[PDB]
């Protein structure tokens, strides 16, 4: 229906089995709600040893991805995607991914994800081949595959059929009623669906306030939310 | 030497092949610098259908991880790790991972990573079994496996043997000298190792300032850095 096609450029395409063969995303793939298609720059080399790295100009500790195989893989992905495909490069220098950012990306019917390895890719390929640079967080990884899979999983949840407000989640409880002396909050046992809703929202507001206060600043709280938060803050003091 | 052992609790242990069988982390594992050991709550069930989910008290859209199999898997991981193992739960409600946070976690010789599925896990298990809750970013995923692998990859880079300052990376260039009309910056061709160092640092400062200005506020710049940044800002204006 609103299905999604995701092209991936990667030296290690088999890593993507982690999302394509397991769990909710695995189901999404099997049911054709999500299509993940991989191209490997190694398949685009022509030398005997299938070389996919190259030396950086200016010297330096490491290597970069070799331009020609990577550029050719990217072109092959663009042609198979047709028009409308947004090309994304995953790196710490990119725009920081958050949930709003995920929902923005979810609007695309087609994405191509370029996963760098070694010390990265040539700056000119970013200029000429990449539409947007994104980061999943301010940390450095050995390759862009985990960030690419992270982004795929997050956008997948917005595809209709895949699944069944600015605050941290409330605590959840399941059997048994008592666990190491710790009891389930009575309200959750009450059946009072409206007290339960309010308790959960209050918990979310309190947790957000204690753990991630800056998140509250980006929000225009409803009257009910303002009240429950104030309550929570009174009880805390 | 300073090798690292990481226990993982997960309903989909095969996802971890993505890091254990490929690239730098795959090499780390083969060379015994990194050991990743998985326990699956499904192996700890006793009912005919190996049930690993359970209904949340208070009602709600989804399911939680069933307490008994998950708790038993966790206990089995703790006993195999011995003393000193820090137990981490991956979730959006956790402390936000960044590079400083990665280096802190890298100090642990033993970690146990608990990967939630469905709508999460019982709050009491977090209280009684989890030492620290961490998030890899402010977005929601179908499971904690990708965040756990993300954390493993990031800390792996700090294990000696695995590989070969608050700013975004500089641009890098490799062959060819001209690509779609775009030339490599002459300084990188000069061989002048000191001009190259300065150009790279200046680029990093400029990129950080333009893309992620808030990152500069957490830094005490050196005199050289202050100068190069000011230069960059003058040229920009
Ligand atoms: N936070 C992220 O999204 C992220 C992306 C990539 C990454 N590392 C890869 C390897 C390659 C060389 O660093 C470069 O292209 C990017 N680390 C972190
Ligand atoms: N940003 C993160 O580290 C992160 C962690 C987990 C996650 N989802 C899993 C599934 C499960 C139910 O939501 C819960 O335990 C956590 N999403 C994001």
């Amino acid at each position: 229906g609103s299905h999604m096609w995701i092209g991936v450029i990667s030296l290690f395409p088999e890593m993507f089995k982690a999302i394509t063969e397991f769990g909710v995303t695995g189901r999404a793939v099997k049911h054709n709600l999500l299509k993940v298609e991989c191209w490997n720059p190694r398949d685009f080399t022509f030398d005997k040893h299938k070389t996919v790295d190259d030396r950086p100009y200016g010297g330096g500790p490491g290597m970069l991805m070799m331009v020609q195989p990577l550029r050719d893989a990217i072109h092959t992905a663009k042609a198979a995607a047709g028009e409308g495909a947004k090309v994304i490069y995953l790196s710490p220098q990119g725009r920081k991914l958050d949930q709003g950012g995920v929902t923005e990306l979810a609007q695309n019917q087609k994405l191509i994800l370029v996963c760098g390895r070694y010390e990265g890719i040539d700056e000119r390929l970013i200029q000429t081949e990449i539409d947007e640079e994104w980061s999943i967080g301010d940390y450095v990884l050995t390759g862009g595959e985990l960030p690419a899979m992270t982004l795929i999983d997050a956008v997948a949840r917005f595809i209709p059929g895949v699944l069944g407000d600015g605050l941290l989640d409330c605590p959840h409880y399941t059997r048994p009623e008592v666990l190491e002396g710790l009891t389930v909050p009575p309200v959750l046992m009450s059946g009072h669906h409206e007290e339960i809703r309010k308790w959960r929202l209050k918990q979310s507001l309190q947790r957000t306030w204690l753990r991630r206060p800056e998140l509250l600043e980006g929000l225009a709280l409803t009257d009910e939310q303002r009240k429950l938060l104030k309550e929570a803050q009174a009880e805390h003091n």
Side-chain angles (χ1 to χ4, degrees), chain A residues 1 3-237:
Chain A
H3 82 107
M4 204 171 178
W5 178 94
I6 303 190
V8 167
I9 313 304
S10 172
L11 294 172
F12 304 101
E14 287 166 293
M15 289 178 71
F16 291 82
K17 291 179 180 180
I19 65 181
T20 62
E21 300 182 358
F22 304 102
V24 172
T25 52
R27 190 169 86 95
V29 169
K30 175 69 168 150
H31 293 357
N32 301 322
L33 300 169
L34 177 59
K35 181 85 179 309
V36 174
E37 201 169 343
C38 300
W39 285 270
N40 188 342
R42 203 189 152 172
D43 297 331
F44 294 84
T45 58
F46 293 107
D47 69 313
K48 189 179 69 214
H49 300 292
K50 302 184 161 60
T51 306
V52 294
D53 61 355
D54 204 357
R55 287 163 92 187
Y57 288 119
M63 305 287 284
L64 293 185
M65 301 188 70
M66 186 178 173
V67 164
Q68 173 269 314
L70 168 60
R71 179 178 190 264
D72 290 348
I74 287 175
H75 288 180
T76 305
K78 287 182 192 219
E83 304 180 0
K86 188 190 294 295
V87 189
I88 293 169
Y89 177 48
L90 290 306
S91 95
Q93 282 73 232
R95 168 178 174 179
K96 197 125 106 303
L97 183 64
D98 57 17
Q99 185 92 308
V102 173
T103 65
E104 279 194 56
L105 290 168
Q107 290 303 281
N108 293 118
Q109 197 269 313
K110 295 168 187 180
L111 290 179
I112 302 183
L113 308 177
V114 178
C115 309
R117 280 268 156 172
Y118 317 114
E119 304 309 322
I121 73 178
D122 193 280
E123 188 66 20
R124 293 160 299 174
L125 288 180
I126 291 179
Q127 296 181 61
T128 64
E129 310 283 353
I130 306 298
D131 297 309
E132 299 173 6
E133 203 161 358
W134 287 80
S135 166
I136 66 158
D138 292 325
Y139 37 82
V140 178
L141 306 175
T142 62
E145 285 81 1
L146 291 170
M149 277 183 282
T150 294
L151 181 168
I152 294 170
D153 183 289
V155 307
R157 299 181 60 260
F158 288 92
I159 298 171
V162 165
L163 293 189
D165 48 14
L167 304 166
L168 307 188
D169 201 8
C170 57
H172 309 292
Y173 299 82
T174 187
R175 301 183 298 167
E177 182 162 358
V178 183
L179 174 59
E180 302 211 28
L182 302 178
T183 52
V184 177
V187 66
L188 302 175
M189 307 294 204
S190 78
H192 292 182
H193 290 290
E194 177 65 11
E195 285 163 41
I196 290 163
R197 182 189 65 83
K198 294 203 300 187
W199 182 89
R200 293 184 166 154
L201 175 52
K202 179 170 188 165
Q203 287 288 308
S204 274
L205 291 161
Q206 177 183 80
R207 272 145 71 93
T208 306
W209 168 59
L210 299 171
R211 299 181 189 195
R212 297 291 306 279
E214 76 284 8
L215 287 180
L216 291 175
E217 292 304 294
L219 306 177
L221 298 178
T222 67
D223 289 355
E224 174 180 53
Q225 290 168 344
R226 292 190 296 106
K227 173 187 58 173
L228 295 171
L229 178 52
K230 278 177 185 166
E231 282 188 16
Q233 296 170 332
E235 301 168 30
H236 193 74
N237 288 21

